[PDB]
Amino acid sequence: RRRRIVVAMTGATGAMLGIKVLIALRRLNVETHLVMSKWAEATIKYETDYHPSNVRALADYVHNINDMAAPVSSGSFRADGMIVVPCSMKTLAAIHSGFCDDLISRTADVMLKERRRLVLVARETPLSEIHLRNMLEVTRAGAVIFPPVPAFYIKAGSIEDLIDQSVGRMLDLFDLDTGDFERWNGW
Amino acid sequence: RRRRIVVAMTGATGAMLGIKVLIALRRLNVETHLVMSKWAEATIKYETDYHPSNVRALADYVHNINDMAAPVSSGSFRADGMIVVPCSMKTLAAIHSGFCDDLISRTADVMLKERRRLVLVARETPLSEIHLRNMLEVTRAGAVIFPPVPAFYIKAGSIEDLIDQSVGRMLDLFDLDTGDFERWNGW
Amino acid sequence: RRRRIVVAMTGATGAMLGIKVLIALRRLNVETHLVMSKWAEATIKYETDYHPSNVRALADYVHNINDMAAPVSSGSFRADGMIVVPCSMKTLAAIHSGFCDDLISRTADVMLKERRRLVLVARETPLSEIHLRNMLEVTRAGAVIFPPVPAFYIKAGSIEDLIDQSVGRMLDLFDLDTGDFERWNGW
Amino acid sequence: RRRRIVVAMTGATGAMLGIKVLIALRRLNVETHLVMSKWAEATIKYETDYHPSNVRALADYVHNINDMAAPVSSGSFRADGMIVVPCSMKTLAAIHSGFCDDLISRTADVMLKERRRLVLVARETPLSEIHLRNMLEVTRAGAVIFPPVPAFYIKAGSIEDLIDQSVGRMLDLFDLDTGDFERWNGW
Amino acid sequence: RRRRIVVAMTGATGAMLGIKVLIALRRLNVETHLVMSKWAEATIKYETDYHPSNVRALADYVHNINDMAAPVSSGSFRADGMIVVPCSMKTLAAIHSGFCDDLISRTADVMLKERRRLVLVARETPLSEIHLRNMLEVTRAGAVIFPPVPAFYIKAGSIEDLIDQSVGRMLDLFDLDTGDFERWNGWE
Amino acid sequence: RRRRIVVAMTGATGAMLGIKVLIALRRLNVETHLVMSKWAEATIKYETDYHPSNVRALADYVHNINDMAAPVSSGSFRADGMIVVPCSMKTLAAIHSGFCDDLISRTADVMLKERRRLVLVARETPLSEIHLRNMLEVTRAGAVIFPPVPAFYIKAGSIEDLIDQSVGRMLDLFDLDTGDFERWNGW
Amino acid sequence: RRRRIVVAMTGATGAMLGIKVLIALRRLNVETHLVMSKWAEATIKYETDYHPSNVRALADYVHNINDMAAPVSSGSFRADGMIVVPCSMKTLAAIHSGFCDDLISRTADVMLKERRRLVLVARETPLSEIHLRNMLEVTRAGAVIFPPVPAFYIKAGSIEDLIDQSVGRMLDLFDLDTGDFERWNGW
Amino acid sequence: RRRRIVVAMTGATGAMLGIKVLIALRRLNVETHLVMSKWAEATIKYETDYHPSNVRALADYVHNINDMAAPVSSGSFRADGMIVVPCSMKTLAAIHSGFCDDLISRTADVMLKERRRLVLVARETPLSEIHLRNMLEVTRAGAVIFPPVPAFYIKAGSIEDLIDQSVGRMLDLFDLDTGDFERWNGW
Ligand SMILES: Cc1cc2nc3c(=O)[nH]c(=O)nc-3n(C[C@H](O)[C@H](O)[C@H](O)COP(=O)(O)O)c2cc1C
Ligand SMILES: Cc1cc2nc3c(=O)[nH]c(=O)nc-3n(C[C@H](O)[C@H](O)[C@H](O)COP(=O)(O)O)c2cc1C
Ligand SMILES: Cc1cc2nc3c(=O)[nH]c(=O)nc-3n(C[C@H](O)[C@H](O)[C@H](O)COP(=O)(O)O)c2cc1C
Ligand SMILES: Cc1cc2nc3c(=O)[nH]c(=O)nc-3n(C[C@H](O)[C@H](O)[C@H](O)COP(=O)(O)O)c2cc1C
Ligand SMILES: Cc1cc2nc3c(=O)[nH]c(=O)nc-3n(C[C@H](O)[C@H](O)[C@H](O)COP(=O)(O)O)c2cc1C
Ligand SMILES: Cc1cc2nc3c(=O)[nH]c(=O)nc-3n(C[C@H](O)[C@H](O)[C@H](O)COP(=O)(O)O)c2cc1C
Ligand SMILES: Cc1cc2nc3c(=O)[nH]c(=O)nc-3n(C[C@H](O)[C@H](O)[C@H](O)COP(=O)(O)O)c2cc1C
Ligand SMILES: Cc1cc2nc3c(=O)[nH]c(=O)nc-3n(C[C@H](O)[C@H](O)[C@H](O)COP(=O)(O)O)c2cc1C
Ligand code: DMA
Ligand code: DMA
Ligand code: DMA
Ligand code: DMA
Ligand code: DMA
Ligand code: DMA
Ligand code: DMA
Ligand code: DMA
């Protein structure tokens, strides 16, 4: 019935990106399935005013990071995509290597084998050859690398305006239209 | 005598990153050599309150984008590094491919052959396999890929605070200390 | 203004190598930051007369293996080098793959992206194609593989004499001279 | 009816490893064929109390390094394996490249084409990309790389104890049990 | 306390390039360690008015090509870099393959493993796929390929002027300024 | 009925090499088709006594650098080979990449697809990994890389002697004998 | 005026192939330049009735294996091709690696760079991955691998009949027709 | 109880090699399973005095080339190895590509997956890059390439003497000793 998208958050800086993804997906009437890593919860508390319990309330369903029996861990579970936002280099490497020992990496591993859209908001700078090799080869395996670089051409008035443009551009990859930002139409 | 760094700006969004790099380098008593692409001047006018003539005044020397006889185009010219900020995918590809048909790509080509530090603030999202292949292989050739992703863990109060942290992290790669941002020291 | 070097120990045999690196680095007035793996602590207990607390007293600062918020885990933290001594195949693989899920592998991951010297005293024999592929490719990413093979040409009288020579050659890679071993100068 | 093993010594430090291999193999009733390089003889004289004449007496047969007509140089010659101990980087590269211009490299070249066990006690530190590429690719061709790294977990009392453990683990690869060292069996 | 640079000469044409490197480094108070191959000595005799004994006098220390126990053959030996000038395809291949069976190739092999600057003035034309593969892959291992192609834009009045510029550009890679050639500064 | 050879000059130093190639080819009764890049004309003026109009007078036919409709730009046009002398790194990369947006790179692109001899006098030092990758891979596509390195073994009396020898060796690749230099015949 | 072909013999079994190549080329009015390795001379003596001096008399010119100043060692020397018959794995590896430390490997190295026909009668069985890697990659560099495998379909009456057929097929690669063997034209 | 070896003959010249393999294996008390391709039967008739029915009588079991249900086509069937003698380039390519559309290529495909010894007496000269790519990559997959090149150093008196030596060296790869040829033991 309703479209399903798995939203995974990891311990890279940029926790507000994952929070605003859940808000935008809820408004778009998308059934969300949230998984938060241990260090994702730590960065949520430290960088934002949200508590992990507040972020869990923004999602239709929540699954435990270590619960490999969760419904989303099986390819038979029907879902239409997954976004890891923000995505740490550790989780990027787990997905690239195939070492799927938690629910985030396993569900991403499953999305790739089932040929479902997987978007990794990989946040790190500068990049080593390890990071770039992982990005290139996971891209060839089917994933989409979305570095959250600001779009300064929108003449933003606040940090939130840039984050809203980024979140809207992320969800474009699932053929979803937030209508929350100004798309380019020339000068 | 004074350290020399070539500062190149291209037509990717984020012109304020290159402007604040020139300001920080001037304060650090670094002799700067500025080159601006045609579309870099266009994005400076459109996203910022600066005019190209204002940015040129922030640099000790300015060289024309099409002047292949400029001093910085020769490896015999002594310089200590180059940063392309912001760096478009087009200029990243010119450097990766070796098609050095303007002063920015030629000077970058020269920095790589002379084994001088070259930093590319490559701004694009999402990334295709073309972008990532260019990033990986130019990295193996010696360049440093620095995607300008914000560091939200600093609890920034403004867009300028995030840009200042990014610029300071860029210049760390030249062993320069702005002292303009708060470095991580735990929670 | 002292030089900072991260000393990481893992659960490969040869715990005395890491202990003597700390002792050396202290005598040369280097500020050492020690991280010990869980199995490093076990190997320290089993094959040396030291206790992990004795090892911690040899370092200027100690960080917990699971504390991903430690200062050394960020590239903004300035450091001059990192040595993993001894380095197990497990940790070598974590660094090669990029699966940086503890402080040793994350700090090493940061050293590579910030282009700082990383020395892996990788101890294992014989070597599989997995080990050698990881060594070769992590070398291309910037790390130095240092197998702790004895230099019998020094005509040592004890195991400790051979360890001292190995430790001295390790620290040569950071441009540090222990002056504790006979450098080669003909027969 | 006796098993034949070619024992080759090259000019890497650690000549005692090859001497003890000859002693251990004689104990095990293996017919040994010794080949010593020119710089192996110099190394034997420098760092051991053995003269090359003493080492030749430890072997059943001795062949000249320059004698490409020696029996071991033909694949039609029955042999069960070969160990280069210690193995220099030069000889590792001769075997990797295929430039078989002396009896050691040619016999190793023959062992690989006849699909016989070839162990290279490659001793060098630190390792360059050249060394590791040669190790990885000669491994894929069928060779076993055995860095002589000490097993400190045996809680040794002398340098000789650690050499004995290494020699025993080397000969494990030929399915031989010296019985002179303590194998791991838990704490 | 002085900087040490190993200067290796091989049997590629261009022996004067190595001779002028030794002279320039002496001028810069660099302690030079010279190794000459067998065919480098033949090339010196044929192409120059120097005898190998004259070239050896230009260096602070000279090591035998066959002496694998020379000080420079160990990584424990302190040194800031090595330049092979001129560098034959044979020696380029020895370094690329790792077949380090003489003092020049072994010392270069050691420079690469110790992460020290290694410059190969590789002289050959035209180039085969063998040469180019060796150049590309040894570059990735850390070496610098410096083909001695003349910089005609200096408007030289003699062969020696072009050689002096090449030698100065070589030593730039060791952060050394001979001050004996005109660096580019736009159109004169 | 005469052989046709395209002579292309680019903005690398060494303009006299291309001028002498034209003179040598004229003496050998070869119909030459000249294309000069914009920066080739500037280098001709700067480092030689020739004017570009003098160089055009040495050729049988001259085509404009931006005229993609020139006869030599089509494979249907009969031609026996092409030499780019001197060849910049920029034009080397244009040919390697296939970005054939001027008459020199397009004609070279055509020579490769029609399996005609293409000689690139690629002049640059030192060489980066970008340059060498382009040289290796364009060689595999069919091109011949000819770095203009002097042949001191001819015991030359002037710069012109060494240039004459290089030019003669260049034209050897087209099975042409200038007879203007001394070929090697032993000591 | 006459065609020049370098004939190189190495220390693989099959010296009679090289001798019969020299006889066939003399009959075809080809100027032959012979180079014999040290182990080719030993092989000639052992498995043929020829003395090396008899083989030298079959050639128009002879050059010493260690004479790097011989005429054929330079690309400036006019020559139409080279055949190494028989070709050892050692010499195959010297050519593949580029380690051209004798006149045979240097002349072959020169033939490849000058784009002249090079035929390697590589004789070894079985083949290792080293041998096949060298064969494949030297082929891509321009060489032709000619294993001297007998053509039994000619219905030979002696060993010499099969040798004559191999020699004729070898020289087919130089566009030469010995005319002393029966080519295939159906049953 | 008895050793089983699959003997496959294909349509390359050298049918007598396959016949003599069958005779040698019968003498060695090895249970042989013969498969002949269509063009091997034509080759047997043309260059030997045997009829295909005579060759079938030399084997213990015979299977039809198109019978994909034969016992040897399954990995569950116990067998100790397989030799394809002689091996055409077509069959070499079928095994390399995996296009196992007859019993010879499928049985070889099975031998590789079950990790059993597979020897390909690949006969062709000269070799293309296609042939050598197939040889190299099928070798890495487990097969042994055995070019039937004669060993002239045995000082043979007839064609059959050289064939007997090749056959004995072939079966050396199955740890079998025909004992009817002189192995090398010096001059
Ligand atoms: C405050 C803080 C910020 C961090 N930011 C990043 C980051 O931007 N990128 C990254 O790759 N890792 C970052 N890390 C490190 C990761 O949290 C660490 O590698 C962790 O093991 C990743 O775990 P996870 O992917 O399972 O959530 C940060 C850590 C902390 C404590
Ligand atoms: C307003 C604007 C913003 C742009 N932002 C980017 C960008 O973020 N990344 C990118 O690769 N190209 C961007 N482009 C496109 C580049 O300007 C374009 O590819 C141009 O050819 C690059 O030229 P240059 O690198 O020589 O300056 C942008 C263009 C415009 C007009
Ligand atoms: C006594 C002992 C000795 C060990 N020696 C080695 C070794 O030499 N090399 C290795 O790769 N692993 C060795 N291991 C196994 C590692 O401890 C194990 O793989 C562990 O997962 C490594 O974890 P760490 O790198 O986080 O310390 C040893 C284990 C024990 C108990
Ligand atoms: C005293 C001494 C110790 C050496 N130790 C090593 C070593 O440990 N590893 C290495 O690759 N080369 C070492 N070498 C250099 C080799 O001996 C040199 O490369 C030589 O050419 C190897 O030749 P071979 O393999 O034929 O014996 C050493 C040389 C000397 C004089
Ligand atoms: C006069 C002369 C000039 C030579 N020039 C070159 C050259 O320019 N490039 C090259 O690769 N080899 C050249 N050689 C060949 C090398 O000397 C030969 O390959 C030798 O084996 C190299 O040995 P080395 O590198 O140890 O000195 C030349 C030889 C001679 C006699
Ligand atoms: C005086 C001068 C000398 C130059 N020499 C070289 C050179 O030797 N090699 C090179 O790659 N570029 C050299 N360049 C830079 C090229 O001219 C520049 O990259 C240009 O874009 C090449 O354009 P073209 O290949 O279309 O002629 C030189 C430039 C100048 C002004
Ligand atoms: C009698 C005899 C036969 C040989 N046959 C071969 C052979 O068929 N293939 C091979 O690669 N090496 C063979 N060799 C070994 C080579 O002679 C040896 O590797 C030598 O180093 C090659 O040197 P060269 O290529 O410079 O002549 C044989 C050696 C001897 C003594
Ligand atoms: C008389 C004759 C001799 C042949 N010799 C060879 C040969 O030596 N090598 C080869 O690859 N093909 C040779 N062929 C071609 C093969 O028979 C042909 O490619 C066939 O398709 C192979 O089929 P098979 O491998 O299934 O037997 C020969 C063909 C004929 C008629
Ligand atoms: C947790 C669980 C039962 C996973 C199995 O589903 P899958 O994605 O591995 O595919 P399949 O339905 O074939 O088992
Ligand atoms: C613009 C110009 C004259 C470039 C030449 O310098 P380079 O970097 O190509 O090196 P070199 O000094 O050897 O010519
Ligand atoms: C604990 C912590 C702050 C980790 C992030 O380090 P970083 O190097 O990724 O920081 P940045 O790239 O934003 O400078
Ligand atoms: C001394 C000698 C005979 C060397 C050739 O060995 P080989 O393995 O090539 O012999 P063959 O392949 O002929 O059995
Ligand atoms: C001549 C000689 C003794 C060389 C050893 O140098 P090395 O670098 O291989 O030894 P180590 O690594 O122990 O310093
Ligand atoms: C100026 C022009 C006609 C270019 C097309 O040449 P082409 O070789 O691509 O065309 P064709 O394949 O028909 O020769
Ligand atoms: C003995 C000798 C002169 C060797 C040089 O040959 P080469 O082909 O390398 O010289 P060049 O490239 O100048 O023609
Ligand atoms: C004719 C037949 C039964 C073929 C199956 O062989 P297999 O080795 O593919 O079967 P399995 O894997 O079940 O042993």
Short mmCIF file of N, CA, C and O in Angstrom, two decimals, chain C residues 82-110:
data_model
loop_
_atom_site.label_atom_id
_atom_site.label_comp_id
_atom_site.label_asym_id
_atom_site.label_seq_id
_atom_site.Cartn_x
_atom_site.Cartn_y
_atom_site.Cartn_z
N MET C 82 51.58 7.83 13.67
CA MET C 82 50.93 6.73 14.37
C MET C 82 51.66 5.44 14.03
O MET C 82 52.02 5.20 12.88
N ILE C 83 51.89 4.61 15.05
CA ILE C 83 52.49 3.30 14.87
C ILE C 83 51.63 2.27 15.60
O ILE C 83 51.32 2.44 16.78
N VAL C 84 51.22 1.23 14.88
CA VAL C 84 50.51 0.10 15.46
C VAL C 84 51.54 -1.01 15.66
O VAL C 84 52.02 -1.60 14.69
N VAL C 85 51.88 -1.28 16.92
CA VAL C 85 53.00 -2.17 17.22
C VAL C 85 52.68 -3.01 18.45
O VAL C 85 52.52 -2.46 19.55
N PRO C 86 52.54 -4.33 18.32
CA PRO C 86 52.49 -5.02 17.02
C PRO C 86 51.11 -4.88 16.38
O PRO C 86 50.16 -4.52 17.07
N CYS C 87 51.01 -5.16 15.08
CA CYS C 87 49.76 -5.02 14.34
C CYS C 87 49.29 -6.39 13.90
O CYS C 87 49.97 -7.08 13.13
N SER C 88 48.12 -6.80 14.38
CA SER C 88 47.55 -8.07 13.98
C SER C 88 46.99 -7.99 12.56
O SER C 88 46.78 -6.91 12.01
N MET C 89 46.75 -9.17 11.98
CA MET C 89 46.09 -9.21 10.68
C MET C 89 44.67 -8.65 10.76
O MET C 89 44.19 -8.05 9.79
N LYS C 90 44.01 -8.83 11.90
CA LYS C 90 42.67 -8.28 12.08
C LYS C 90 42.68 -6.76 11.94
O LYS C 90 41.87 -6.19 11.20
N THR C 91 43.59 -6.09 12.65
CA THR C 91 43.62 -4.63 12.60
C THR C 91 44.15 -4.13 11.27
O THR C 91 43.66 -3.12 10.73
N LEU C 92 45.14 -4.82 10.70
CA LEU C 92 45.55 -4.53 9.33
C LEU C 92 44.35 -4.55 8.38
O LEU C 92 44.21 -3.66 7.53
N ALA C 93 43.48 -5.54 8.54
CA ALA C 93 42.32 -5.65 7.66
C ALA C 93 41.30 -4.55 7.94
O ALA C 93 40.67 -4.03 7.01
N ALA C 94 41.10 -4.20 9.21
CA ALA C 94 40.20 -3.10 9.54
C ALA C 94 40.66 -1.80 8.88
O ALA C 94 39.85 -1.03 8.36
N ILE C 95 41.97 -1.56 8.88
CA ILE C 95 42.51 -0.35 8.26
C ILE C 95 42.39 -0.43 6.74
O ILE C 95 41.98 0.54 6.08
N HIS C 96 42.74 -1.58 6.16
CA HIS C 96 42.64 -1.74 4.71
C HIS C 96 41.20 -1.59 4.23
O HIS C 96 40.93 -0.86 3.27
N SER C 97 40.27 -2.29 4.88
CA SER C 97 38.88 -2.24 4.45
C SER C 97 38.23 -0.89 4.75
O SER C 97 37.27 -0.52 4.08
N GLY C 98 38.74 -0.16 5.74
CA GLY C 98 38.11 1.05 6.20
C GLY C 98 37.06 0.86 7.28
O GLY C 98 36.43 1.84 7.69
N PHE C 99 36.85 -0.38 7.74
CA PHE C 99 35.86 -0.66 8.79
C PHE C 99 36.45 -0.21 10.12
O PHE C 99 36.99 -0.99 10.91
N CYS C 100 36.33 1.10 10.37
CA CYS C 100 36.97 1.74 11.53
C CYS C 100 35.97 1.80 12.68
O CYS C 100 35.36 2.83 12.97
N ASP C 101 35.82 0.66 13.36
CA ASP C 101 34.84 0.53 14.44
C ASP C 101 35.47 0.51 15.83
O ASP C 101 34.76 0.26 16.81
N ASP C 102 36.77 0.77 15.95
CA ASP C 102 37.37 1.04 17.25
C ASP C 102 38.35 2.20 17.10
O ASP C 102 38.59 2.69 15.99
N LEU C 103 38.91 2.63 18.23
CA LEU C 103 39.73 3.84 18.21
C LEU C 103 41.05 3.63 17.46
O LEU C 103 41.57 4.57 16.86
N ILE C 104 41.59 2.41 17.49
CA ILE C 104 42.83 2.15 16.77
C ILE C 104 42.61 2.28 15.26
O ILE C 104 43.33 3.01 14.58
N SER C 105 41.59 1.59 14.74
CA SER C 105 41.36 1.63 13.30
C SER C 105 40.84 2.99 12.84
O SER C 105 41.17 3.43 11.74
N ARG C 106 40.04 3.67 13.67
CA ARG C 106 39.55 4.99 13.29
C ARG C 106 40.68 6.01 13.27
O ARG C 106 40.78 6.82 12.34
N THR C 107 41.55 5.99 14.29
CA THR C 107 42.68 6.91 14.29
C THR C 107 43.59 6.64 13.10
O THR C 107 44.00 7.58 12.41
N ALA C 108 43.88 5.37 12.82
CA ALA C 108 44.66 5.03 11.63
C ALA C 108 43.97 5.51 10.36
O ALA C 108 44.62 6.02 9.44
N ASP C 109 42.64 5.36 10.29
CA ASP C 109 41.88 5.86 9.15
C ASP C 109 42.06 7.36 8.99
O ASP C 109 42.16 7.87 7.86
N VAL C 110 42.10 8.09 10.11
CA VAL C 110 42.25 9.54 10.05
C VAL C 110 43.67 9.92 9.64
O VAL C 110 43.87 10.87 8.88
#
